[PDB]
Amino acid sequence: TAGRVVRITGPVVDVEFPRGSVPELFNALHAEITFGALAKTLTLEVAQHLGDSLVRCISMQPTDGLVRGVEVTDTGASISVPVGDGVKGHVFNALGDCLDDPGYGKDFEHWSIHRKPPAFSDLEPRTEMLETGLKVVDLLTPYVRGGKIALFGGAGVGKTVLIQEMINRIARNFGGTSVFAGVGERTREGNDLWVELADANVLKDTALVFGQMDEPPGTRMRVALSALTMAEFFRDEQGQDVLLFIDNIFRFTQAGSEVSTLLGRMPSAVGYQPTLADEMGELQERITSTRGRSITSMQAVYVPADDYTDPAPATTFAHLDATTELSRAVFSKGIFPAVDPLASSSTILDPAIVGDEHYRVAQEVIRILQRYKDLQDIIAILGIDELSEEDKQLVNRARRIERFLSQNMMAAEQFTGQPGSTVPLKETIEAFDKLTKGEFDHLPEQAFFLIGGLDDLAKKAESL
Amino acid sequence: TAGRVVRITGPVVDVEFPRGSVPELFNALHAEITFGALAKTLTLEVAQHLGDSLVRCISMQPTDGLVRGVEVTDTGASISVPVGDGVKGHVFNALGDCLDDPGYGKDFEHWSIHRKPPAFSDLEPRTEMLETGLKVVDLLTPYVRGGKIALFGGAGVGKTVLIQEMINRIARNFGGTSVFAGVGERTREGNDLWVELADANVLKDTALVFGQMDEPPGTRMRVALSALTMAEFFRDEQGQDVLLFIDNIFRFTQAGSEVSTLLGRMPSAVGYQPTLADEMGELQERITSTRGRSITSMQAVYVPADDYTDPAPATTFAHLDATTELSRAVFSKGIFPAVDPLASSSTILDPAIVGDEHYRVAQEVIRILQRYKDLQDIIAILGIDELSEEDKQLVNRARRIERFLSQNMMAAEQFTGQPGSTVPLKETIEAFDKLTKGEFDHLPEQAFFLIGGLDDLAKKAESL
Amino acid sequence: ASRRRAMKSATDNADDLIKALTLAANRERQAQITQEISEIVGGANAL
Amino acid sequence: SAADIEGAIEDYVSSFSADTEREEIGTVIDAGDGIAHVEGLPSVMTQELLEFPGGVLGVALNLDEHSVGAVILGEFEKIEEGQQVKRTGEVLSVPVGDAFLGRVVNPLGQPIDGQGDIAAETRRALELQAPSVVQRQSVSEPLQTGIKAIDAMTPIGRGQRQLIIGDRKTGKTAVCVDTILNQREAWLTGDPKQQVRCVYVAIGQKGTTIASVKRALEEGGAMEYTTIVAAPASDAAGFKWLAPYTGSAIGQHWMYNGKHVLIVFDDLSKQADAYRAISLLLRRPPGREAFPGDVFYLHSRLLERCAKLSDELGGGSMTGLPIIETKANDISAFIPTNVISITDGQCFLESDLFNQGVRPAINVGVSVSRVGGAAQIKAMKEVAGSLRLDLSQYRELEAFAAFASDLDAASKAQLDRGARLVELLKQPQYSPLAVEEQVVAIFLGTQGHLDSVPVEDVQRFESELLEHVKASHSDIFDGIRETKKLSEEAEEKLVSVINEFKKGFQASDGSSVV
Amino acid sequence: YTGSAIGQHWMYNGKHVLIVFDDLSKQADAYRAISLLLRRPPGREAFPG
Ligand SMILES: Nc1ncnc2c1ncn2[C@@H]1O[C@H](COP(=O)(O)OP(=O)(O)OP(=O)(O)O)[C@@H](O)[C@H]1O
Ligand SMILES: [Mg+2]
Secondary structure (H helix, E strand, O other): OOEEEEEEEOOEEEEEOOHHHOOOOOEEEEEEEOOOOOOEEEEEEEEEEEEOOEEEEEEOOOOOOOOOOOEEEEEEEEOEEEEOHHHOOOEEEOOOOEOOOOOOHHHOEEEEOOOOOOOHHHEOOOOOEEOOOOHHHHHHOOEEOOOEEEEEEOOOOOHHHHHHHHHHHHHOOOOOEEEEEEEOOOHHHHHHHHHHHHHOOOHHHEEEEEEOOOOOHHHHHHHHHHHHHHHHHHHHHHOOOEEEEEEOOHHHHHHHHHHHHHHOOOOOHHHOOOOHHHHHHHHHHHOOOEOOEOEEEEEEEEOHHHOOOOHHHHHHHOOOOEEEEEOHHHHHOOOOOOEOOOOOEEOOOOHHHHOHHHHHHHHHHHHHHHHHHHHHHHHHHHOHHHOOHHHHHHHHHHHHHHHHHOOOOHHHHHHHOOOOOOOOHHHHHHHHHHHHHOOOOOOOHHHHOOOOOHHHHHHHHHHO | OOEEEEEEEOOEEEEEOOHHHOOOOOEEEEEEEOOOOOOEEEEEEEEEEEEOOEEEEEEOOOOOOOEOOOEEEEEEEEOEEEEOHHHOOOEEOOOOOEOOOOOOOOOOEEEEOOOOOOOHHHEOOOOEEEOOOOHHHHHOOOEEEOOEEEEEOOOOOOHHHHHHHHHHHHHHOOOOEEEEEEEEEOHHHHHHHHHHHHHHOOHHHEEEEEEEOOOOHHHHHHHHHHHHHHHHHHHHOOOOOEEEEEEOHHHHHHHHHHHHHHHOOOOOOOOOOOOHHHHHHHHHOOOOEEOOEEEEEEEEOOOHHHOOOOHHHHHHHOOOOEEEEEOHHHHHOOOOOOEOOOOOEEOOOOOOOOOHHHHHHHHHHHHHHHHHHHHHHHHHHHOHHHOOHHHHHHHHHHHHHHHHOOOOOHHHHHHHOOOOOOOOHHHHHHHHHHHHOOOOOOOOHHHHOOOOHHHHHHHHHHOO | OHHHHHHHHHHHHHHHHHHHHHHHHHHHHHHHHHHHHHHHHHHHHHO | OOOHHHHHHHHHHHHOOOOOOOOOEEEEEEEEOOEEEEEEOOOOEOOEEEEOOOOOEEEEEEEOOOOEEEEEOOOHHHOOOOOEEEEEEEEOEEEEOHHHOOOEEOOOOOEOOOOOOOOOOEEEEOOOOOOOHHHEOOOOEEOOOOOHHHHHHOOOEEOOEEEEEEOOOOOHHHHHHHHHHHOHHHHHHOOOOOOEEEEEEEEOOOHHHHHHHHHHHHHOOHHHOEEEEEEOOOOOHHHHHHHHHHHHHHHHHHHOOOOEEEEEEEOHHHHHHHHHHHHHHOOOOEOHHHOEOOHHHHHHHHHOOOOEEOHHHOOOEEEEEEEEEOHHHOOOOHHHHHHHHHOOEEEEEOHHHHHOOOOOOEOEOOEEEOOHHHHOOHHHHHHOOOHHHHHHHHHHHHHHHHHOOOOOHHHHHHHHHHHHHHHHHOOOOOOOOOHHHHHHHHHHHHOOOOOOOOHHHHHHHHHHHHHHHHHHOHHHHHHHHHHOOOOHHHHHHHHHHHHHHHHOOEOOOOOEOO | OHHHHHHHHHHOOOOOOOOOOOOHHHHHHHHHHHHHHOOOOOOHHHOOO
8 A cells, every 4th residue: 555656846845645545744755766877765755735645745865756556655654863972973864864874773773853842831941040151141142951942043154163163162072961952053064063073072963864955845844853852862861961052043043944834834924934933933932942941043044135133033032041142243243253232132041040149240241242333333424533432442342342252162273272161151241341330441352362361361461 | 696706815705607797897785794793784786797797895894704606686776975064074985884873874875986076078178276174275385176186294283273274164165065084084083073173063064985995905005085975965956165185185195006916916116906096096086176176185195114205105206196295393383283384285376367466476485485384593502692683683584484373273163162263265365465574573473373363463462 | 613514414314314224125135026926926837 | 630631521522512503615727836725615704703613713704706815724735626715603703701811823813832722711803893982081091011111201101002113123012021021010910900911912923932922021020911922923814813812802801791801912013914914915906015005994993992992981001112123224114104193102213323322222312202201100200301402412412422511511411421421311121111210210210319420320310229229228119109290398308218229229331420 | 967967977987077157057058047937837937837
């Protein structure tokens, strides 16, 4: 009672089954491409039941070479991925096939990539700060241990560099298990991460699942779920604190959009699929942490057209506790990690959690930066000399604060040559309190660029 | 013979009729919702003929609970509204059902709300000014008999008091009536207007026709036509000058846009219906003077994004003869009716329609008020004493002029007791000629507040 | 006195530039709405 | 513990009886992306509640001559071609009763907080008529939000529909949670004419955010009179579409029973997005931003349930506080324009003001309330009358902050007054102020008692002064609360206590304030 | 794709290649034309998904 391919349109394949054997939605079907150059077993995922015993499926491997009328056999269950401590230290694709050691986990326990989010009864808010060592993040966008963190950004503003730096700052000393889901990112950076983790002996505690952009929409849809399944196994079946890095979670919605019109859906605003919010909500809600079981998830989010009003980033914003927001405007000015201090935010940045001193310093920094942003229009035309004395002093403060939020990160050694630096949260608060209060107005502003700490500030000021 | 509902997609209902009995366009059909909780009689307005004896209709009432195959009975005539002296003092919906007294007017003469505008040979070739009796309107922005007036304003700027004032003046001076076409009413605002008019005892001279916001777009689109049909009956049959308020005719445009979208018609420039200009023309062209009687209309207009080049306001303003703009600044200065003499405008303030003396006096007043508005910044920042003697003289004269533009409205009689003043146009012209020439610059400013004409000015001056 | 005149001229030029930029922003707002609707209804017509 | 562990089941077995009633069946012919087309069901009615084999539920939303397109309410993956679909003869209805206070319920009224079932007093259809023009009453009773900015500048009177509109992370949920918290003093009175019952409808929020809001309400004591109708982002588009209607129905049951309700929709933008998704999946024609033609109606049909009923209907009221996220502060977008048209007033929250430290960040001036002074107690009406003009003058004068020597005496005084008023309207989160405290605080600023305090200390000077008055001169607060006006003798007492406090107040700069 | 295939044949034989696509904006336009002529519904800017 096998199916039969009727209609092939790019990644979407229609399969007609006998009446009593139409597969359930999200089931995995196996076709076979027999052309020698592209011969393979093609995994389709039932996406729609279309009637007349037809189903419409999203192909995981490229359909190049698939022939109409070819037998399609139903697996009887959704796409399953290996789970267990065996996955740690290995590289998998969306289908659960190991890359660095083919046929490795074929005998492990296999879990469906599709499962309901944890019940609302089991969710409690997370309010524990995660000290990354980055001045800007630790000060203005403090990350939440067990919470949801995002690195929004345009195209090529440093999301991959910053997420690699966060892997270097959070996972290297982490006692639990890490999972990295490369969802439609660049394969070069995936291999760079693989070798970096191998050299630092973190690979033994890290599971990598790659669905990089060379792959068709099906994998770029289901790879995030495949990695999140391993993360959920570590969360539930083992109780180990889990890190879940995803890069880039936008590719999930973008792949859904890519297959949207071939599935017959009428496009929504900006050409996205009508199911953007629900499709992304399921995946995002599976990432939350349940009480006593922590997942510290960091999701690099890509903002199309550098437009933060785009439906995808805008809808993703509601799913996050901390949201660092890289901007091309800051990147152009040479500031690396390229964070917009004003657009970025964090829910743990309250006086009741980070303390009154940290909160006051962060809010004063944001106030100074907002006033500077408001004044930049005046300065570019009427000149600095026409500002108020207080506003002039504030502008001098704000330039130094912007440059001090820059930091020489470890992952950016090949961007600057100099080694990385780590700044304790206490030192960050003290330094920014001094800046905002004036103790450093006499130092040149270039002394604050790519230094990371007060000792480095003094050394670079002396070198100037 | 009776039709059957064959499709129900929100407000859109398709009805299949026997081949010989398909209703013609805009006919009102009745369907029955028999479900107990939602029991209703839907009034469907035939909008298209689809063929095979199907007609697509826009439901004037929520279609929740409607069942396929339910009998649909054709009334044989389009949406008809009760017309007569009986509609005065009562509130109706777009379909002529009385809201404050159900079953009222079901035995009146009923008129179809789809009526052609007056024949071309029946139109008045000469614009005639409407001497409403208010000094500000008659001098600065004279209203047009049979024309349209935009009424810009908001909350706490006396828009409702001005509506009451114009209802009183049309009912008393011209012996006419008013019809308040509440397109897209907030039910709270509609109830407030109903109680305000009842308390002011002007409800007996006005017929309210509310198409609330909670109703589907069909009624919001047809309520303006219904109220205008009552106004047409008053104009043509009773032989009365009418004053058709339309708050807010942007709503009418947007209801048309929503109906167009529901029927599947491709949207125009900014998403508006392709026939925006024709719907607006079919509405506005009926508001005109014929055979010696006229329907004047004060139509509150919303300008989306404050963009007067937007298709909706751009189409609306092709028909607007005058523009009264109420101002919060003027209202706070005690200057009721709160009309801004500078922002407001009229297309009849030309030497030809009005007398040359009228135009000269109005332009002199506008010049004085503009010069004063310019000097407001210096007065507020530098103080009054930093002006020149000529500037101080002009400031005094402008203060007195702008305060004399206030008037003891009839709508205020209910609060104070002082009968409202109906200043003749000639008296207003000569009074403002005296003001602009400085003949009254020695009276105290409080003398000019809320007084109609030179006699009242002299009496109040002697009373101070 | 020259500063008064120059700043009055600057304020007038800034107001005119604000008006021009507002007219422009309205044009691109309407154009974005139109283009979005064209894309949406082009997808609709094809499906 | 008890015998009930068995007894309940016994009661079921003794009482259970599945009788054989005739049923009309359809068959699922299509199924995809949350929509299932059901051939058959000739007598199905629009927006009916169909039940699918696996306990799944759907809403018959498109009715054609071929099929019934139904939006599936969760568990969509369990729907298959050929499945039998039974029609429940009931349009969308939700249970309602006082048992929903302190409960978190999904848009169908089923608890999701993990506690026991909810004892429903009755059921209400989600699409019942809103109160008609003849059935309403003028909005005249304040609903103290506890936020000085809102209660002074854009007052919300119970029966009103006030829109909290602004970009992300600007303070909207904070404003509405503060409003919910501020009703605890009214609740503890026990007088239904004062009690306000809250319904926080979360649409499209993540589960942990709803949990955070519930925690904020519990630690604030507000959960004993608040229900949370939660449609988390994990839930189907149908739940996000229905949640405002569920909350509105739960509130309406109280409203028609003489109680006063406060409904927070957070957000209605996600409601609109879910409706757009459903409409496009059902192939309903799209319009601007792809929203269906009746999206305005979707919101209007909702917000117009929020009304104050006439005394003939018990005089109950339901206050709407829809929350809308404006992208890049574009209040001219489609949904923001629609809901600004629908609502009675708007608190516009701006990120620029938030970063300046003007948090709660209401952009006064642009922000408006059409109900106006009718929604304020006489004390606040008289005290806060000059506040709006003062703030407007301050915003006009802000360009002159650097030349205070060159301005007129009146202009410089206005600038100094405005800076202190701006500092006065600032307010910490989760700390709403009772109306008497707001009256005294605004009295400090409008009457000029802050003109001697430094700007940077105003926030403290107010905070301490009230802390003093409450503890030692509560007669002022009691008078304002019991009489609703600031009497002349009470005003003199307040001025005397302010002056006495001034002497003992230490300005942060070390100067003396007298 | 033809250039990439020609280059890849060398790449997999241990030789270093430098591919210049002048311009990929015109490939996108060509793909848009092909997709619209095949009547694939477009996405944003009329481009295919
Ligand atoms: N009055 C206030 N004083 C200080 N912090 C505040 C205030 N109001 C809100 N905040 C903080 O601002 C941030 C945003 O608050 P909130 O969650 O209410 O925002 P929102 O507008 O509902 O946005 P979101 O779209 O994320 O739900 C939170 O850190 C909150 O603590
Ligand atoms: Mg919020």
